[PDB]
Paper text:
We introduce a new family of fungal protease inhibitors with β-trefoil fold from the mushroom Coprinopsis cinerea, named cocaprins, which inhibit both cysteine and aspartic proteases. Cocaprins are small proteins (15 kDa) with acidic isoelectric points that form dimers. Cocaprins inhibit plant C1 family cysteine proteases with Ki in the micromolar range, but do not inhibit the C13 family protease legumain, which distinguishes them from mycocypins. Cocaprins also inhibit the aspartic protease pepsin with Ki in the low micromolar range.
CCP1 crystallized in P21 space group with two molecules in the asymmetric unit. CCP1 has a β-trefoil fold, consisting of only β-strands. The fold resembles a tree with a six-stranded β-barrel as a stem and additional three pairs of β-strands and connecting loops as the tree crown. The three-dimensional structure of cocaprin 1 showed similarity to fungal β-trefoil lectins. Based on the crystal structure, we designed mutations in the surface exposed loops, which were of sufficient length to be able to inhibit aspartic and cysteine proteases. Equilibrium constants were determined for the inhibition of papain and pepsin, which indicated that the β2-β3 loop containing the N22R mutation was involved in papain inhibition because this mutant had an approximately ten-fold higher Ki value. Since the same mutant had a Ki value for pepsin inhibition comparable to that of the wild type CCP1, this suggests that the inhibitory reactive sites for aspartic and cysteine proteases are located at different positions on the protein. Only the N22 mutation in CCP1 significantly reduced its ability to inhibit cysteine proteases, suggesting that the β2-β3 loop is critical for inhibition, which is different from that of clitocypin. The corresponding loop in CCP1 is much shorter and consists of only five residues (Val99-Ala103). It makes a rather tight turn between β strands β9 and β10 and does not protrude from the globular core of the protein, so it is unlikely to be involved in aspartic protease inhibition.
Author numbering: 3 to 138
């Protein structure tokens, strides 16, 4: 479905599935490889699955239970995300565990460093929780 890149607003790096283990989700400088492209499938009511182009793995969280600092990971099963415009800047998006306050978060204050882990964390104003979803 609609294939998109997902760039962190604060870090400037792409949501990337580690090319070596195909499991760890981290920020990496955008190069346009399939591991940085994500198939957004609309389930309904602006709920989505987000499926890596490289592996077919779905964006999810380790062990499925949302909490502060639970890391993002690739799953063989679908995991549902709410995707909506940020409240302060309508031009960017949040990607969240549905009906929870746990938002997809670029760790270490949205560090631009390649390999910066992506996780979920309680919703804050931080642009490290804001993403640009755009075609590629």
């Amino acid at each position: 479905p609609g294939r998109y890149r997902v760039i962190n607003v604060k870090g400037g790096t792409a949501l990337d599935l580690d090319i070596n283990n195909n499991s760890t989700v981290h920020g990496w400088a955008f190069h346009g490889g399939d591991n940085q492209l994500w198939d957004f499938e609309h389930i309904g009511d602006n709920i989505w699955t987000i499926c890596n182009a490289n592996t077919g793995g779905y964006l999810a969280i380790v062990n499925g239970i949302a909490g502060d600092g639970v890391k993002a990971v690739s799953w063989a099963d679908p995991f549902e995300w709410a995707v909506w415009p940020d409240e302060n800047d309508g031009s960017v998006w949040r990607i969240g565990v549905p009906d929870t306050a746990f938002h997809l978060d670029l760790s270490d204050h949205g560090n631009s460093a390649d390999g910066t882990a992506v996780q979920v964390w309680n919703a804050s104003d931080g642009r490290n929780q804001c993403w640009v979803v755009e075609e590629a």
